[PDB]
């Protein structure tokens, strides 16, 4: 494995992550209806949790990516040439299957990267973050030169451009996958491991449960509904999440720097740090039910979501970096790998429970009346 092959493989993993998350990022950017995002998250978490316990073959990765590409093409075709009900039905079914396929593809890529020397998971993480920031930048460049037609509540040319970009990057990722990868071919009880690291599992659930309660739902979809936020400002508000979510994962990992020494602190302090995140719920509701100019401000709404995004990414990586420090009776290599599997399950369960908890806020008369 010389420098050329290492560079090619790292680029391939970056492209895998970017292409996998481009669909979710462009669904967020286009202000797609909330139920479609909910369906996508449900499919993603279900497929990921199922694929954790089942070793699906790694030859299916190009096929899953091609399925995602043809699903994006179907998005474009349905938006262009279909009626309202047909477009809605296709959107819901396609978003469910996209969530499932993306989860399976990410699981395959994780398995392929992990089972190697000089593990390549960090490159896929970088690819995911680059996908987020790249979709943000593309949205801002599109908003200048694209008319706001809003055929079915979604911009026409903006949707076309975003999905052709997704298809192009995904086909390039398929080419790299085919060229580079080779796709041919005593322990403590689970209850004992759960009892040791029950705080780490709990903290992973809490951070994801709260941030998916707010961001895609109450986050930018009830402020816009209430204050009539311009479509140009929505991409900035959504972008403050995707940019800061990625950039907050890194400082916890770089603890060898004097600046980031205190970014990984503890599990007991993490539990009370996730409780201070509960103060975001009053903040997000106030942005949607108060009228004076302070809350009707693009600057503080961007800050109100940058802080949520920064703490979301920061508190997702912390439990992984400290859980080994507090556990007592787990000492083998396999056990810690099993425990790390418990933590990623708490992430996906957190995403599923968080996204479906947004419907709790529908009961309260949060949004302002139209008059």
């Amino acid at each position, epitope marked *: 494995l010389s420098s050329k092959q290492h560079f090619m493989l790292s680029l391939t993993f970056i492209l895998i*992550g970017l292409s996998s998350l481009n669909v979710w990022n462009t669904a967020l950017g286009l202000n797609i209806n909330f139920k479609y995002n909910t369906f996508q998250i449900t499919g993603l978490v279900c497929s990921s949790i199922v694929a954790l316990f089942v070793e699906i073959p790694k030859i299916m990765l190009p096929f899953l990516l091609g399925g995602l590409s043809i699903l994006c093409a179907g998005f474009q075709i349905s938006h262009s040439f279909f009626t309202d009900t047909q477009f809605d039905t296709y959107c819901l079914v396609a978003f469910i299957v996209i969530g499932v396929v993306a989860g399976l593809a990410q699981t395959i890529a*994780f398995n392929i*990267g*992990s089972t190697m020397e*000089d*593990n390549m*998971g*960090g490159y*896929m*993480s*970088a690819g*995911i*973050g680059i996908s987020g920031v790249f979709i943000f930048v593309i949205n801002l460049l599109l908003d200048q030169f694209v008319s706001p037609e809003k055929h079915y509540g979604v911009n026409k040319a903006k949707l076309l451009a975003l999905y052709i970009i997704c298809e192009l990057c995904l086909i390039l990722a398929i080419v790299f996958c085919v060229c580079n990868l080779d796709l041919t071919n005593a322990t403590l009880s689970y209850m004992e491991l759960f009892k040791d690291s029950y705080k780490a599992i709990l903290t992973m659930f809490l951070v994801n449960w709260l941030t998916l309660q707010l961001f895609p739902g109450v986050g930018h979809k009830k402020w816009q509904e209430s204050h009539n936020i311009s479509d140009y400002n929505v991409t900035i508000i959504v972008g403050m999440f995707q940019v800061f979510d990625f950039l907050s*994962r*890194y400082p916890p*990992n*770089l*603890t*060898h720097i004097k600046i980031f020494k205190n970014f*990984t602190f503890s599990l007991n302090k993490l539990l009370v740090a996730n409780s201070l995140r509960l103060l975001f719920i009053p903040w997000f509701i106030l942005n949607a039910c108060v009228d004076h100019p302070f809350f009707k401000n693009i600057v503080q709404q961007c800050v109100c979501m940058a802080m949520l995004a920064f703490t979301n990414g920061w508190f*997702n*990586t912390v439990p*992984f*970096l*400290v859980f*080994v*420090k*507090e*556990l*007592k009776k787990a*000492k083998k*290599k396999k056990e*810690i*790998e099993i425990i*790390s599997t418990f*933590l*990623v399950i708490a992430m996906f369960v957190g995403l599923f429970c968080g996204i479906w908890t947004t419907y709790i806020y529908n009961l309260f008369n949060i949004v302002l009346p139209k008059p």
Partner: nanobody
Amino acid sequence: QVQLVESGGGLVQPGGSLRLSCAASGFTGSINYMGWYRQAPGKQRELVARFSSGGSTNYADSVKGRFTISGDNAKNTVYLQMNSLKPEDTAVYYCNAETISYVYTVVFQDYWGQGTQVTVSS
């Protein structure tokens, strides 16, 4: 890059003692464990001692009650005071560091040091 620096190799009369010091520089991400794996001439690597970030110590029953592992976390340096030496402990000792990053997905990475020769004879 990640650099594992070791010190302590040498030749010792039987019944003597040594101190093996190991330090980690890059360790991108956290650091879960630091241990010593000895490889005898013409044999496979075998665990000798391991020290967790918290402080849990693993030992090999061959050196049980003889070698004592101490750790640090601010400097990520691990020391091994090895006592009551006998000729069958001659080997090359490899410092191993097991880490974890999870930027977006969990990764476990092991970094191995160059290894110090330890000989007991004469």
